[PDB]
Amino acid sequence: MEMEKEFEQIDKSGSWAAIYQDIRHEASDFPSRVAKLPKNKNRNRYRDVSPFDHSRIKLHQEDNDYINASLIKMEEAQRSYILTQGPLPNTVGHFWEMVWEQKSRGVVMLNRVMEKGSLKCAQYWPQKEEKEMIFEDTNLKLTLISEDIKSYYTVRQLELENLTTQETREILHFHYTTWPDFGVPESPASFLNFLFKVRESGSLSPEHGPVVVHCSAGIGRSGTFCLADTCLLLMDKRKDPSSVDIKKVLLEMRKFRMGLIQTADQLRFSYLAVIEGAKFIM
Numbered sequence: 001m002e003m004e005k006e007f008e009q010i011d012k013s014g015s016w017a018a019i020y021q022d023i024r025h026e027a028s029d030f031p032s033r034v035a036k037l038p039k040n041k042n043r044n045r046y047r048d049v050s051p052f053d054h055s056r057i058k059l060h061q062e063d064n065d066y067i068n069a070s071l072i073k074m075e076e077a078q079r080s081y082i083l084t085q086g087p088l089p090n091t092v093g094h095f096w097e098m099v100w101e102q103k104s105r106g107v108v109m110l111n112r113v114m115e116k117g118s119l120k121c122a123q124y125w126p127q128k129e130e131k132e133m134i135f136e137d138t139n140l141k142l143t144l145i146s147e148d149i150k151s152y153y154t155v156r157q158l159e160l161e162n163l164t165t166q167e168t169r170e171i172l173h174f175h176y177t178t179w180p181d182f183g184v185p186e187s188p189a190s191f192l193n194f195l196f197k198v199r200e201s202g203s204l205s206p207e208h209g210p211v212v213v214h215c216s217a218g219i220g221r222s223g224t225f226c227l228a229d230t231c232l233l234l235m236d237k238r239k240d241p242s243s244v245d246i247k248k249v250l251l252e253m254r255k256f257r258m259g260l261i262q263t264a265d266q267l268r269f270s271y272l273a274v275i276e277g278a279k280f281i282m
């Protein structure tokens with residue numbers, strides 16, 4: 001396998017940091033003017049992570065249409081993803097408005113609410129069936145329907161009601177709960193198993209709106225998830241699977257959201273996953 005070769009060459013030469021910096025150097029730079037307006041300062045978790053204006057998701061309201069979320073459209077793979085930050089106390093209602101307006105079936109969460117002893121995102125979904133959440137600012141109701149807790153992830157069935165029209169939809173919550181506080185997982189086996197469960201649900205399929213994916217910033221773990229999915233999909237589509245260039249897919253994705261893959265260890269882990277997941281379809 002070519003990727004596993006380029007892989008062994010970088011490992012033996014210990015040049016992961018050098019590859020990663022070349023990607024950082026070649027990555028696209030587009031304006032983020034709406035993100036930086038003073039009215040939007042409390043809608044942004046991190047000062048240095050912003051959606052580009054050309055690819056930002058717009059909320060359907062006249063007041064303020066701004067959320068820290070981007071549409072990543074992969075033309076050849078025929079996949080779309082919305083990458084977004086972990087919701088803030090004042091953006092939980094915007095988050096669910098976006099899920100509603102964009103017709104998403106699935107939410108993918110790659111972080112714990114608390115990590116390293118700090119809050120990484122708001123408790124944005126209900127933890128008990130009989131204690132539903134109402135978002136008065138966006139006129140939505142969210143109810144926990146069921147919860148399936150496994151060793152590496154939890155799947156939840158949620159009901160989202162538009163209180164304005166009384167339509168309801170089922171949203172699936174896929175929560176990967178075992179990403180370590182520091183570094184990346186030692187094996188990609190549990191991450192690939194999780195990706196295959198999201199795919200099996202129909203959440204990634206063209207009959208729905210784009211899947212919503214987040215971690216804390218929505219660029220690191222979130223980038224790893226959509227890079228691995230797209231590379232595996234291209235490998236099954238192209239006549240020469242060996243032609244799939246992970247660095248080139250990543251730069252394409254970086255035209256839509258800045259900073260995807262935050263460390264050289266995340267880049268190496270992405271290779272391992274696409275290598276392992278491929279070596280499993282073969």
Ligand SMILES: O=C(O)c1ccc(-c2ccco2)s1
Nearest residue numbers: 001002235236241242278281
């Ligand atoms: O370089 C090589 O030999 C390959 C890389 C990926 C492959 C594949 C085939 C089906 C799914 O992935 S073959």
